[PDB]
C-alpha cells in the first residue's frame, strides 16, 4: 500500500541475518538504515526521537492543524479530538496520555536545554535520553552497548537530567 524511498531489495547470493531487529545489536532493518534519503535524494541521518522531542512536535502539529481547521483561531484530552474517526481518536489519545505519564521534561524551556546538552551513533544518543538512569552502573547494564566505548561524561549526563527533572 504505502511505500518509501528505499526500494528494490532484489535477491542476493549471500543471505543476511543482520536484518532481524535487535536494538542491542543496532539492527533496525532495511527501512531504518543509518543513512536514509529524503524525497529529493539528499542524504540524511536517521531521525530517532526521544520522549521529550516527540511530545513537543506532535502536540504542536495537532494544534497548528486545529487552528488551521478553524481558519486561524494545553490539555491532552482536548487535543486528541482533532482527529477524524473513532479509530484515529483512540491511538492518538492513548499516545499523548502515555507520554503525559512518562515524559520528564514536559515543556520546551527544559527540553531545549536537554536538546543542546545532547546535541557516536545516532541511535545510542537517542536511547540515553529515553531511559532514565541514576548512576553509570545502571546505564551499561540495561543498555549493554555502552560498555566498550571508553567515553563516559555519563555521570554529568545523568546529573543534568536529574537536576533539570522537576519534583513530583
Amino acid at each position: 500500500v504505502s511505500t518509501s524511498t528505499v526500494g528494490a531489495r532484489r535477491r542476493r547470493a549471500k543471505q543476511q541475518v543482520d536484518d532481524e531487529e535487535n536494538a542491542t545489536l543496532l539492527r533496525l532493518g532495511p527501512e531504518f538504515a543509518l543513512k536514509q534519503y529524503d524525497h529529493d535524494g539528499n542524504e540524511h541521518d536517521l531521525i530517532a526521537l526521544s520522549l521529550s522531542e516527540s511530545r513537543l512536535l506532535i502536540r504542536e502539529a495537532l494544534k497548528a492543524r486545529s487552528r488551521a481547521r478553524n481558519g486561524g483561531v494545553i490539555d491532552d484530552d482536548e487535543l486528541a479530538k482533532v482527529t477524524s474517526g473513532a479509530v484515529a481518536n483512540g491511538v492518538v489519545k492513548k499516545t499523548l496520555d502515555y507520554l503525559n505519564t512518562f515524559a520528564r521534561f514536559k515543556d520546551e524551556e527544559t527540553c531545549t536545554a536537554v536538546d543542546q546538552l545532547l546535541h557516536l551513533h545516532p541511535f545510542e544518543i537517542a536511547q540515553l535520553s529515553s531511559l532514565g538512569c541514576e548512576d553509570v552502573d545502571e546505564a551499561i547494564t540495561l543498555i549493554p552497548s555502552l560498555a566498550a566505548k571508553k567515553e563516559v561524561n555519563l555521570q554529568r549526563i545523568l546529573d543534568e537530567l536529574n537536576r533539570l527533572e522537576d519534583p513530583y
Binding site: 500500500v1 535477491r11 542476493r12 547470493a13
Partner: protein, 518 residues
C-alpha cells in the same frame, strides 16, 4: 472493470528477468507432491489426491472451487506441483552447453583452466557481453588438454582432461591415460556431473558467464520436475460422455510410471545391465516431454501412430503460442462480408448492413447530456433499431435485455454504461487482407443501409487493391472513447489521400467516372 476489486497496487511490467528454477525454489512454489499415475480414485468420481488431477492444482470445472485460493475457475490461475525424480537426468535443451562446460573446467575439482597471468586470456575476461566472454574463454582453454595441478598451485588436481563427445542423450568422455597406450572412455552419467558442478566456486561461476542468483550451472540438470496445473493440459470430450487426455497428461503418466520402476530396482533384483535400460528410459521420456524433435533418433509416438506434441512444438511455427496467439490472435467486435461499390456515398463512408449493425455494439457512458437520448434506446430493446443490448453498472453486472421482461422499470444512473447499437457517423476501422501497407487499414464513418454487402465509395478501391468480384473485407469497432478519437484524428480516410511511399496520391477518379469525365 471485469476484474473484481483488489487492494494490491496495479503496476505495469518494466523488465523480464529470465533464468533457471532451482530445485529448492520448485518445491517452495509447489502445493503438492505427485506420486501416483492413476488419475482416478477408483473410477468412482472425485480424482485421487497425490494424482495428476489432484484438486489442489486447480479447477477446470465450473462447480468445484480451488482448494488453495477459493476463487472460481475463471479467476484461478492454477498452481504448480512437483515430481521428485529418483535419479537426476539431463535437460534435453542444455546438453550442447553442458558439453562446452566440461572442456572448460577440471573434471575433478571444477576450476577454470586459465588465469589472468596469461596475457591474451586477461584480455578475454574484459569482454563485457557474457556470451562472447564465455566463448572467448572456451576458445583459449579448448587446446589446454590437461588440468594443471601447478600454475603454468592453482587448486588443480593434475588430471588430464577427456575429449567429451555427444552420442544422442549420452555423453562419452575419452581420457588419455599416461607413448600411445589404451584409453578407456566411460559414460559420464548425469549424477556424476551433478556433484562436480556443485563444487564450482562463485568466482569461477561468474567467469563462465553464468550468474550466481539466476542461472547457477548445476540447475541445468533436472532433479525435480514442475507439474503444470490443468489449465496447461485441459481435457476435451470427443463425443460428449467420452473424454481423452492431453498429450502432456499421457506423457506425464509415462514419466511417473517410469519413475516408480527406478525406485523398484535399487532395493532388490538389479542385474546392472537392467539398471542402464531403465534409467536411460527415464531420460528418454523426460527428453521427449520437452522436445520431441531430437535429431538422430526416432520420435515418441502416440498409440494412434502420430507423434507426441511436446512443449517445444507448442511454441514454434505458425500455429504455436507465439506466432499464433501472441503476435496475432482472434478478436471480438469484428465482422466480414462481400463488398459492393456505391458512387452515392462520401469518400470516408462505409455502408453497413442492418443485421451487422444490430450485432456489433459500442459501450457509451451515460452523462447528463445524453441520459434522455439513451433511455429511448433502452425501451426499443435489442430487436428494434435504433436500440441497445446491455446496461452495465459500475460493479460490472450486465443486464441482458433479451430476457428482461421489466425493461420499462430501468432508471439509468450517471456513470453506468449502455451498449447501444452501431449508429450513423460512428468511426470503424476497415481492412482487407493481405495488409501490404498502411492504407490497408483506414477509418470510415458508418452509414447503416439495407442489404447484406459492405458499401464503399468507388475511389477507395485502389488503396485496398479491392474489387467486387467476390472480395471480402473486415470491420473492427473500437470499444472506448480514447480509441474513437485516435481513429478519427490519425487513421481517417482524408488524412490518407497522399501516401509517403512516393509523395503522391493513392486515390483518384477511376473507371466509369474517369472514362466519363474525359
Amino acid at each position: 472493470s471485469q476484474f473484481p476489486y483488489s487492494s494490491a497496487p496495479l503496476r505495469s511490467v518494466k523488465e523480464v528477468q529470465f533464468g533457471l528454477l532451482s530445485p529448492e525454489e520448485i518445491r517452495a512454489i509447489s502445493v503438492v507432491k505427485i506420486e501416483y499415475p492413476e488419475i482416478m480414485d477408483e473410477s468412482r468420481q472425485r480424482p485421487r489426491e497425490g494424482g495428476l488431477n489432484d484438486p489442489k492444482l486447480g479447477s477446470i470445472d465450473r462447480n468445484f472451487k480451488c482448494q488453495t485460493c477459493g476463487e472460481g475457475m475463471a479467476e484461478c490461475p492454477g498452481h504448480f506441483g512437483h515430481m521428485e525424480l529418483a535419479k537426476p537426468v539431463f535437460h534435453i535443451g542444455f546438453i550442447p552447453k553442458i558439453k562446452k562446460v566440461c572442456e572448460c573446467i577440471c573434471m575433478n575439482c571444477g576450476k577454470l583452466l586459465l588465469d589472468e597471468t596469461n596475457p591474451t586470456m586477461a584480455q578475454a575476461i574484459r569482454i563485457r557481453d557474457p556470451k562472447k566472454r564465455f566463448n572467448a574463454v572456451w576458445q583459449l582453454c579448448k587446446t589446454k588438454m590437461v588440468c594443471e595441478a601447478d600454475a603454468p598451485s592453482r587448486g588443480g588436481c593434475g588430471n588430464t582432461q577427456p575429449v567429451v563427445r555427444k552420442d544422442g542423450m549420452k555423453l562419452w568422455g575419452t581420457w588419455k591415460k599416461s607413448r600411445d597406450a589404451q584409453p578407456e572412455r566411460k559414460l559420464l552419467t548425469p549424477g556424476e556431473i551433478l556433484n562436480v558442478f556443485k563444487h564450482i566456486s562463485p568466482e569461477d561461476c561468474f567467469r563462465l558467464g553464468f550468474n550466481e542468483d539466476y542461472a547457477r550451472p548445476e540447475w541445468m540438470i533436472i532433479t525435480v520436475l514442475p507439474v503444470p496445473p490443468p489449465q496447461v493440459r485441459p481435457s476435451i470430450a470427443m463425443d460428449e460422455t467420452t473424454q481423452g487426455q492431453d498429450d502432456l497428461t499421457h506423457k506425464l503418466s509415462d514419466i511417473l510410471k517410469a519413475n516408480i520402476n527406478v525406485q523398484k530396482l535399487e532395493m532388490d533384483g538389479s542385474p546392472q545391465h537392467i539398471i542402464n535400460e531403465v534409467e536411460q528410459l527415464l531420460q528418454f521420456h523426460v527428453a521427449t516431454y520437452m522436445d520431441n524433435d531430437i535429431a538422430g533418433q526416432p520420435q515418441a509416438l502416440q498409440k494412434s501412430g502420430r507423434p507426441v506434441k511436446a512443449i517445444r512444438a507448442r511454441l514454434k511455427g505458425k500455429e504455436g503460442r507465439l506466432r499464433g496467439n501472441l503476435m496475432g490472435k482472434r478478436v471480438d467486435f469484428s465482422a466480414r462480408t462481400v463488398i459492393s461499390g456505391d458512387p452515392n456515398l462520401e469518400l470516408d463512408q462505409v455502408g453497413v448492413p442492418i443485421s451487422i449493425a444490430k450485432t456489433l455494439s459500442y459501450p457509451e457512458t451515460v452523462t447528463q447530456y445524453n441520459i434522455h437520448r439513451l433511455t429511448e434506446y433502452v425501451r426499443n430493446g435489442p430487436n428494434e433499431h435504433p436500440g441497445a443490448k446491455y446496461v452495465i453498472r459500475d460493479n460490472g453486472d450486465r443486464i441482458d435485455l433479451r430476457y428482461h421482461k421489466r425493461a420499462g422499470d430501468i432508471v439509468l444512473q450517471y456513470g453506468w454504461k449502455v451498449e447501444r447499437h452501431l449508429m450513423d457517423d460512428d468511426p470503424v476501422l476497415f481492412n482487407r487482407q493481405p495488409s501490404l501497407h498502411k492504407m490497408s487499414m483506414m477509418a470510415h464513418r458508418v452509414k447503416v443501409m439495407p442489404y447484406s454487402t459492405f458499401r464503399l465509395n468507388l475511389s477507395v478501391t485502389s488503396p485496398y487493391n479491392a474489387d467486387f468480384d467476390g472480395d471480402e473485407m473486415n470491420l473492427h469497432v473500437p470499444q472506448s472513447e480514447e480509441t474513437r478519437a485516435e481513429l478519427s484524428q490519425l487513421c481517417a480516410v482524408p488524412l490518407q489521400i497522399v501516401s509517403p511511399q512516393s509523395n503522391k496520391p493513392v486515390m483518384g477518379i477511376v473507371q466509369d467516372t474517369l472514362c466519363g469525365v474525359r
